[PDB]
Design a protein around this ligand. Sequence first.
Ligand code: GVN
Lengths: 336, 20
Amino acid sequence: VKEFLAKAKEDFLKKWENPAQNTAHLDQFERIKTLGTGSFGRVMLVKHMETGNHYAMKILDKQKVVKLKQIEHTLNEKRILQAVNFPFLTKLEFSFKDNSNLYMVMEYAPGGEMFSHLRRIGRFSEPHARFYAAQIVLTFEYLHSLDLIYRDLKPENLMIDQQGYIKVTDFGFAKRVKGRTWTLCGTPEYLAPEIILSKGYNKAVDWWALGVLIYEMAAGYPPFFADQPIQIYEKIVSGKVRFPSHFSSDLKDLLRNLLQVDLTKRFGNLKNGVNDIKNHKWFATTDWIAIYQRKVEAPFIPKFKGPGDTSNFDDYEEEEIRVSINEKCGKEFSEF
Amino acid sequence: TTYADFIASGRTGRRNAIHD
Ligand SMILES: NC[C@@H](c1ccc(Cl)cc1)c1ccc(-c2cn[nH]c2)cc1
């Protein structure tokens, strides 16, 4: 584990210090369908024509990125995503920019968003939730060792692959930080109390977010919800969580230690680190090496209608990929 | 029930990130 991580950091740092750049071009891809939408961009299913491979292409409108003050955050995403390498992260295959847009081509996960299946099915059994949670635990162990904070864990950002395993995607708020950082970012339901209270925070906020995810996966709703974000933040800072009666003894206990406002007590943030989580009773049945190696049978496996099947994704209004004849925001995105 | 309150809430759809 410690040896694997050391070698992993060696691989990462080389790519981190000399990022790949301009490794493709738009018209090497056939744009097939919009798989999802964001405030400054969208993700499309595309086919790489020279290989016939299907990919997910994140298209970011440079002007919109600038307007939402996400320049540095978008540079973080691309710089981190091109450097990392882990089974449960969507691999960044290519990146490039043109006059109007930034492009990040990643591995296509045809199983769709966890969000979709979690909402439809209602909730996951504890073994089902545990299976996904373990992959997140390992992914955060990997990311955090690289001094990376993830900062946007949620079902919407957890893609299911052909084998039913998780691919963490969307690194817009990912940041390589040693020490505290301060940006107010994330999704309201998943914000740690630190973030809400403007304290300045560290990777512990990812472990709190793990608590929210596990809860939501197992309960079918998150531990803090309301109609408006303000109401949600009040609940998060309150220091109170109720568990459904069907939650096991062990699960309740894992959640109390994950969803812990006290940093000195929050699991993942103690001297023993992520092993407080790994060695917890709720994870007793979990074979961590087996999960990393993907030799564990997935509780749910998506329907294989074929390559580039999008039936596990919702339908979004398709929209032009317009490329201006003038270069926009050249200086801002120079290093992309 | 809590499930009923969630499903009746305006935040069962995809949740956007926050910023500033
Ligand atoms: N919310 C996840 C979604 C997304 C993220 C960011 C933007 Cl700007 C739009 C949409 C998303 C959907 C699908 C994929 C995907 C990656 N590989 N296969 C699917 C990644 C992110």
